[PDB]
Protein backbone atom coordinates (compact mmCIF):
# COMPACT_ATOMS: atom_id res chain seq x y z
CA UNK A 1 0.00 0.00 0.00
CA UNK A 2 1.03 3.67 -0.29
CA UNK A 3 -0.74 6.70 1.25
CA UNK A 4 -0.08 10.43 0.97
CA UNK A 5 0.68 12.51 4.05
CA UNK A 6 -1.31 15.55 5.21
CA UNK A 7 0.42 18.58 6.65
CA UNK A 8 -0.59 21.54 8.81
CA UNK A 9 1.83 24.29 9.73
CA UNK A 10 0.22 26.01 12.72
CA UNK A 11 1.56 27.52 15.93
CA UNK A 12 0.75 26.96 19.61
CA UNK A 13 -0.19 30.41 20.85
CA UNK A 14 -1.66 33.29 18.80
CA UNK A 15 0.90 34.82 16.37
CA UNK A 16 2.53 37.90 17.85
CA UNK A 17 5.30 39.58 15.85
CA UNK A 18 8.50 39.66 17.83
CA UNK A 19 7.39 37.23 20.54
CA UNK A 20 8.86 33.73 20.65
CA UNK A 21 6.61 30.76 20.02
CA UNK A 22 6.46 27.21 18.70
CA UNK A 23 5.74 26.11 15.15
CA UNK A 24 4.03 22.81 14.45
CA UNK A 25 4.04 20.68 11.29
CA UNK A 26 1.55 17.88 11.97
CA UNK A 27 2.10 15.22 9.28
CA UNK A 28 -0.67 12.62 9.30
CA UNK A 29 -2.43 9.85 7.33
CA UNK A 30 0.56 8.32 5.53
CA UNK A 31 2.26 5.04 4.61
CA UNK A 32 4.93 3.66 4.38
CA UNK A 33 6.13 4.82 7.79
CA UNK A 34 9.43 5.86 6.19
CA UNK A 35 9.16 9.64 6.06
CA UNK A 36 11.34 12.78 6.17
CA UNK A 37 10.15 16.12 7.65
CA UNK A 38 11.86 19.53 7.61
CA UNK A 39 11.18 23.07 8.75
CA UNK A 40 12.27 26.15 6.78
CA UNK A 41 12.64 29.61 8.31
CA UNK A 42 12.87 31.14 4.80
CA UNK A 43 14.09 28.23 2.74
CA UNK A 44 16.98 27.12 4.93
CA UNK A 45 16.88 24.08 7.19
CA UNK A 46 16.20 24.69 10.88
CA UNK A 47 17.86 23.50 14.17
CA UNK A 48 17.30 19.86 13.07
CA UNK A 49 13.81 20.18 14.73
CA UNK A 50 12.25 18.00 17.47
CA UNK A 51 10.53 14.89 16.07
CA UNK A 52 7.61 13.80 18.23
CA UNK A 53 7.47 10.04 18.41
CA UNK A 54 5.38 8.46 15.67
CA UNK A 55 2.15 6.49 16.08
CA UNK A 56 -0.83 5.39 13.99
CA UNK A 57 -4.66 5.46 14.18
CA UNK A 58 -7.29 2.71 14.01
CA UNK A 59 -7.20 3.32 10.27
CA UNK A 60 -3.56 2.21 10.22
CA UNK A 61 -2.23 5.51 8.79
CA UNK A 62 0.77 7.02 10.52
CA UNK A 63 1.06 10.29 12.46
CA UNK A 64 3.84 12.47 13.82
CA UNK A 65 4.59 15.97 15.10
CA UNK A 66 7.61 18.06 14.13
CA UNK A 67 7.98 21.14 16.27
CA UNK A 68 10.52 23.91 16.63
CA UNK A 69 10.49 27.12 18.63
CA UNK A 70 10.18 30.20 16.44
CA UNK A 71 9.61 33.95 16.57
CA UNK A 72 7.24 35.00 13.65
CA UNK A 73 6.08 38.55 12.51
CA UNK A 74 6.42 39.47 8.81
CA UNK A 75 10.04 38.67 9.22
CA UNK A 76 10.28 35.59 7.11
CA UNK A 77 8.10 32.90 5.66
CA UNK A 78 8.03 29.58 7.53
CA UNK A 79 7.27 26.25 5.92
CA UNK A 80 7.52 22.49 6.20
CA UNK A 81 8.96 20.35 3.39
CA UNK A 82 7.87 16.72 3.53
CA UNK A 83 9.77 14.15 1.53
CA UNK A 84 8.02 10.79 1.33
CA UNK A 85 7.61 7.90 -1.09
CA UNK A 86 3.90 8.22 -1.88
CA UNK A 87 4.56 11.68 -3.31
CA UNK A 88 6.31 12.63 -6.54
CA UNK A 89 8.11 15.81 -5.46
CA UNK A 90 8.82 17.27 -1.98
CA UNK A 91 5.50 18.82 -0.99
CA UNK A 92 6.10 21.94 1.06
CA UNK A 93 3.62 23.96 3.10
CA UNK A 94 3.80 27.52 4.33
CA UNK A 95 2.64 28.76 7.69
CA UNK A 96 -0.39 31.02 7.80
CA UNK A 97 -0.77 32.82 11.14
CA UNK A 98 -4.31 33.73 10.08
CA UNK A 99 -4.98 30.10 9.02
Amino acid sequence: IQKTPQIQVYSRHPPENGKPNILNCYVTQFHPPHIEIQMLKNGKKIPKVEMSDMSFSKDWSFYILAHTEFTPTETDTYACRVKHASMAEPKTVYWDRDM
Binding site: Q2, Q8, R12, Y26, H31, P32, P33
Partner: protein, 273 residues
Protein backbone atom coordinates in the same frame (compact mmCIF):
# COMPACT_ATOMS: atom_id res chain seq x y z
CA UNK B 1 -16.10 4.28 29.88
CA UNK B 2 -12.37 3.46 29.75
CA UNK B 3 -9.95 1.50 27.57
CA UNK B 4 -6.44 0.10 27.40
CA UNK B 5 -5.02 -0.02 23.89
CA UNK B 6 -1.60 -1.31 22.87
CA UNK B 7 -0.38 -0.38 19.38
CA UNK B 8 2.23 -2.63 17.80
CA UNK B 9 4.53 -1.76 14.89
CA UNK B 10 7.05 -4.02 13.18
CA UNK B 11 8.90 -2.87 10.08
CA UNK B 12 11.56 -4.84 8.22
CA UNK B 13 14.36 -2.82 6.62
CA UNK B 14 16.58 -4.49 3.96
CA UNK B 15 20.33 -4.21 4.46
CA UNK B 16 19.75 -2.28 7.67
CA UNK B 17 19.67 -5.01 10.30
CA UNK B 18 16.83 -6.46 12.34
CA UNK B 19 13.30 -5.08 11.83
CA UNK B 20 12.48 -2.02 13.86
CA UNK B 21 10.14 -2.76 16.73
CA UNK B 22 7.84 -0.37 18.53
CA UNK B 23 5.28 -0.95 21.27
CA UNK B 24 3.11 1.96 22.31
CA UNK B 25 0.26 1.69 24.78
CA UNK B 26 -2.58 4.10 25.44
CA UNK B 27 -5.03 4.45 28.28
CA UNK B 28 -8.23 5.95 26.88
CA UNK B 29 -6.39 8.58 24.87
CA UNK B 30 -3.04 8.77 26.62
CA UNK B 31 0.39 7.28 26.01
CA UNK B 32 1.47 5.70 29.29
CA UNK B 33 4.25 3.43 27.95
CA UNK B 34 6.71 2.98 25.10
CA UNK B 35 9.23 0.42 23.85
CA UNK B 36 11.56 0.94 20.90
CA UNK B 37 14.25 -1.34 19.53
CA UNK B 38 16.62 1.09 17.82
CA UNK B 39 16.84 3.13 21.05
CA UNK B 40 20.16 2.84 22.94
CA UNK B 41 18.68 0.88 25.82
CA UNK B 42 15.31 -0.68 24.75
CA UNK B 43 13.60 -0.38 28.12
CA UNK B 44 9.81 -0.40 28.16
CA UNK B 45 9.69 3.09 29.76
CA UNK B 46 6.75 5.28 30.95
CA UNK B 47 5.17 8.32 29.28
CA UNK B 48 2.85 9.21 32.16
CA UNK B 49 3.76 10.75 35.52
CA UNK B 50 1.41 8.47 37.44
CA UNK B 51 3.35 5.50 36.09
CA UNK B 52 5.95 6.05 38.79
CA UNK B 53 3.68 3.95 41.01
CA UNK B 54 5.26 0.79 39.53
CA UNK B 55 8.37 -0.80 41.00
CA UNK B 56 11.46 -1.97 39.03
CA UNK B 57 9.87 -5.42 38.53
CA UNK B 58 6.95 -4.15 36.44
CA UNK B 59 9.43 -2.40 34.17
CA UNK B 60 11.78 -5.39 34.02
CA UNK B 61 8.85 -7.78 33.54
CA UNK B 62 7.36 -5.80 30.65
CA UNK B 63 10.75 -5.32 29.03
CA UNK B 64 11.46 -9.04 28.68
CA UNK B 65 7.92 -9.72 27.51
CA UNK B 66 8.62 -7.12 24.86
CA UNK B 67 12.02 -8.39 23.74
CA UNK B 68 10.21 -11.69 23.37
CA UNK B 69 7.50 -10.26 21.15
CA UNK B 70 10.10 -8.35 19.10
CA UNK B 71 11.36 -11.80 18.19
CA UNK B 72 8.10 -13.52 17.33
CA UNK B 73 7.55 -10.78 14.75
CA UNK B 74 10.85 -10.89 12.87
CA UNK B 75 9.70 -14.44 12.27
CA UNK B 76 6.27 -13.22 11.28
CA UNK B 77 7.75 -10.80 8.76
CA UNK B 78 9.49 -13.86 7.32
CA UNK B 79 6.34 -15.92 7.62
CA UNK B 80 4.30 -13.39 5.59
CA UNK B 81 7.11 -12.92 3.06
CA UNK B 82 6.66 -16.61 2.36
CA UNK B 83 2.90 -16.51 2.19
CA UNK B 84 2.61 -13.74 -0.39
CA UNK B 85 5.76 -14.71 -2.28
CA UNK B 86 7.80 -11.52 -1.85
CA UNK B 87 11.60 -11.11 -1.85
CA UNK B 88 14.03 -10.26 0.95
CA UNK B 89 14.66 -6.94 -0.75
CA UNK B 90 11.41 -5.30 0.30
CA UNK B 91 10.44 -3.27 3.33
CA UNK B 92 7.21 -4.41 5.00
CA UNK B 93 5.04 -3.54 8.01
CA UNK B 94 3.14 -5.48 10.68
CA UNK B 95 0.48 -3.63 12.70
CA UNK B 96 -1.38 -4.94 15.72
CA UNK B 97 -3.96 -3.52 18.07
CA UNK B 98 -4.56 -5.13 21.44
CA UNK B 99 -6.68 -3.76 24.25
CA UNK B 100 -10.01 -3.75 26.04
CA UNK B 101 -12.72 -1.42 27.28
CA UNK B 102 -14.95 -1.22 30.33
CA UNK B 103 -18.11 0.76 31.06
CA UNK B 104 -18.93 2.96 34.05
CA UNK B 105 -19.20 -0.43 35.75
CA UNK B 106 -15.71 -1.54 34.78
CA UNK B 107 -17.47 -4.49 33.17
CA UNK B 108 -15.81 -5.30 29.82
CA UNK B 109 -17.73 -3.73 26.94
CA UNK B 110 -15.44 -4.58 24.01
CA UNK B 111 -11.99 -6.13 23.59
CA UNK B 112 -9.93 -6.90 20.50
CA UNK B 113 -6.77 -7.84 18.60
CA UNK B 114 -6.38 -6.52 15.04
CA UNK B 115 -3.60 -7.08 12.50
CA UNK B 116 -2.52 -5.23 9.33
CA UNK B 117 0.10 -6.21 6.75
CA UNK B 118 1.52 -3.22 4.79
CA UNK B 119 -1.22 -0.82 5.87
CA UNK B 120 -4.10 -3.22 5.20
CA UNK B 121 -6.21 -5.51 7.35
CA UNK B 122 -4.60 -8.94 7.62
CA UNK B 123 -6.81 -10.54 10.25
CA UNK B 124 -8.84 -9.62 13.30
CA UNK B 125 -10.66 -11.34 16.15
CA UNK B 126 -14.40 -10.89 16.12
CA UNK B 127 -16.63 -9.26 18.73
CA UNK B 128 -17.70 -12.78 19.62
CA UNK B 129 -14.12 -12.97 20.92
CA UNK B 130 -13.86 -16.55 19.69
CA UNK B 131 -13.85 -16.50 15.85
CA UNK B 132 -11.61 -14.64 13.36
CA UNK B 133 -12.14 -12.76 10.12
CA UNK B 134 -9.40 -12.87 7.50
CA UNK B 135 -8.67 -10.29 4.81
CA UNK B 136 -6.94 -12.50 2.20
CA UNK B 137 -5.93 -16.12 1.48
CA UNK B 138 -2.78 -15.41 3.47
CA UNK B 139 -4.75 -14.67 6.59
CA UNK B 140 -6.63 -17.93 6.02
CA UNK B 141 -3.33 -19.72 6.51
CA UNK B 142 -2.85 -18.03 9.86
CA UNK B 143 -6.51 -18.51 10.71
CA UNK B 144 -6.22 -22.23 9.98
CA UNK B 145 -3.25 -22.24 12.35
CA UNK B 146 -4.67 -20.19 15.20
CA UNK B 147 -7.92 -22.17 15.00
CA UNK B 148 -6.44 -25.53 15.89
CA UNK B 149 -4.02 -23.85 18.27
CA UNK B 150 -7.13 -22.39 19.93
CA UNK B 151 -5.55 -18.93 19.89
CA UNK B 152 -8.89 -17.05 20.04
CA UNK B 153 -9.63 -19.04 23.17
CA UNK B 154 -6.43 -17.90 24.88
CA UNK B 155 -7.01 -14.33 23.66
CA UNK B 156 -10.50 -14.44 25.12
CA UNK B 157 -9.12 -14.84 28.64
CA UNK B 158 -6.64 -12.00 28.24
CA UNK B 159 -9.36 -9.52 27.28
CA UNK B 160 -11.79 -10.50 30.07
CA UNK B 161 -9.47 -10.69 33.05
CA UNK B 162 -5.82 -9.79 32.53
CA UNK B 163 -6.53 -6.70 30.43
CA UNK B 164 -9.59 -5.39 32.30
CA UNK B 165 -7.69 -6.11 35.50
CA UNK B 166 -4.64 -4.06 34.50
CA UNK B 167 -7.05 -1.48 33.09
CA UNK B 168 -8.23 -1.03 36.69
CA UNK B 169 -4.88 -0.42 38.30
CA UNK B 170 -3.62 2.20 35.86
CA UNK B 171 -6.85 4.16 36.18
CA UNK B 172 -6.28 4.32 39.93
CA UNK B 173 -2.56 5.02 39.44
CA UNK B 174 -3.57 8.27 37.76
CA UNK B 175 -7.28 9.04 38.05
CA UNK B 176 -6.48 12.69 38.76
CA UNK B 177 -5.45 13.09 35.12
CA UNK B 178 -7.19 10.73 32.72
CA UNK B 179 -10.34 12.46 33.95
CA UNK B 180 -9.41 16.12 33.63
CA UNK B 181 -11.23 18.30 31.15
CA UNK B 182 -10.17 21.58 29.57
CA UNK B 183 -12.87 23.86 28.09
CA UNK B 184 -12.46 24.76 24.38
CA UNK B 185 -11.84 28.49 24.08
CA UNK B 186 -13.79 29.71 21.08
CA UNK B 187 -13.99 32.82 18.88
CA UNK B 188 -14.65 33.87 15.29
CA UNK B 189 -12.47 35.84 12.88
CA UNK B 190 -13.51 37.97 9.86
CA UNK B 191 -11.61 37.74 6.54
CA UNK B 192 -12.10 39.69 3.29
CA UNK B 193 -12.21 37.95 -0.09
CA UNK B 194 -12.54 38.25 -3.92
CA UNK B 195 -15.61 39.50 -5.72
CA UNK B 196 -17.17 40.36 -2.43
CA UNK B 197 -17.95 37.57 0.07
CA UNK B 198 -16.44 36.65 3.40
CA UNK B 199 -14.81 33.81 5.39
CA UNK B 200 -15.96 33.46 9.02
CA UNK B 201 -13.60 31.22 10.98
CA UNK B 202 -14.52 29.40 14.19
CA UNK B 203 -11.69 28.60 16.58
CA UNK B 204 -11.48 26.10 19.44
CA UNK B 205 -8.18 25.94 21.26
CA UNK B 206 -6.46 24.27 24.18
CA UNK B 207 -9.23 21.77 24.68
CA UNK B 208 -9.01 18.27 26.10
CA UNK B 209 -9.87 15.60 25.42
CA UNK B 210 -9.51 15.55 21.67
CA UNK B 211 -12.97 14.95 20.24
CA UNK B 212 -14.91 18.19 20.16
CA UNK B 213 -17.36 19.08 17.37
CA UNK B 214 -17.38 22.28 15.32
CA UNK B 215 -20.29 23.18 13.05
CA UNK B 216 -21.84 26.18 11.28
CA UNK B 217 -25.58 26.74 10.84
CA UNK B 218 -27.70 29.24 8.92
CA UNK B 219 -30.99 30.36 10.41
CA UNK B 220 -31.37 27.02 12.13
CA UNK B 221 -29.89 24.33 9.90
CA UNK B 222 -26.31 23.10 9.96
CA UNK B 223 -24.09 23.81 7.00
CA UNK B 224 -22.43 20.39 7.27
CA UNK B 225 -22.14 20.91 3.56
CA UNK B 226 -20.09 23.80 2.17
CA UNK B 227 -17.90 24.57 5.18
CA UNK B 228 -14.16 23.90 5.39
CA UNK B 229 -12.76 21.91 8.29
CA UNK B 230 -9.34 20.76 9.51
CA UNK B 231 -8.45 17.56 11.41
CA UNK B 232 -8.24 18.19 15.16
CA UNK B 233 -4.60 19.02 15.85
CA UNK B 234 -2.25 19.03 18.87
CA UNK B 235 -0.86 22.32 20.13
CA UNK B 236 1.97 20.51 21.91
CA UNK B 237 1.08 21.24 25.53
CA UNK B 238 -1.32 18.37 26.04
CA UNK B 239 -4.04 20.48 24.39
CA UNK B 240 -5.75 20.33 21.02
CA UNK B 241 -7.00 22.94 18.62
CA UNK B 242 -9.26 22.88 15.60
CA UNK B 243 -11.24 25.27 13.46
CA UNK B 244 -14.08 25.37 10.95
CA UNK B 245 -14.80 28.08 8.40
CA UNK B 246 -17.47 29.01 5.87
CA UNK B 247 -18.03 31.56 3.07
CA UNK B 248 -20.88 33.98 3.60
CA UNK B 249 -22.42 36.90 1.60
CA UNK B 250 -20.67 40.06 2.79
CA UNK B 251 -22.89 42.33 4.86
CA UNK B 252 -25.17 39.43 5.74
CA UNK B 253 -22.67 38.17 8.31
CA UNK B 254 -24.84 37.90 11.42
CA UNK B 255 -27.18 35.26 9.93
CA UNK B 256 -24.60 32.60 10.82
CA UNK B 257 -23.67 30.85 14.08
CA UNK B 258 -20.90 28.52 15.25
CA UNK B 259 -21.59 25.54 17.51
CA UNK B 260 -19.08 23.91 19.87
CA UNK B 261 -19.92 20.54 21.41
CA UNK B 262 -17.37 19.08 23.86
CA UNK B 263 -17.38 16.91 27.01
CA UNK B 264 -16.02 19.91 28.89
CA UNK B 265 -18.86 22.10 27.77
CA UNK B 266 -21.92 21.26 29.83
CA UNK B 267 -23.82 23.28 27.20
CA UNK B 268 -22.78 23.70 23.55
CA UNK B 269 -21.26 27.09 22.71
CA UNK B 270 -22.71 29.70 20.39
CA UNK B 271 -20.48 32.20 18.61
CA UNK B 272 -20.86 35.01 16.09
CA UNK B 273 -18.42 37.36 14.48
Amino acid sequence: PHSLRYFVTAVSRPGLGEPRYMEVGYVDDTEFVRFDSDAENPRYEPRARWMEQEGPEYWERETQKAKGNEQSFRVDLRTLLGYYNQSKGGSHTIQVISGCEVGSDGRLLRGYQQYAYDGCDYIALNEDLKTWTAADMAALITKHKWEQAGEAERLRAYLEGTCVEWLRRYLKNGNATLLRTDSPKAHVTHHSRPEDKVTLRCWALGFYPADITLTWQLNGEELIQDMELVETRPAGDGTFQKWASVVVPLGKEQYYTCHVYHQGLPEPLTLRW
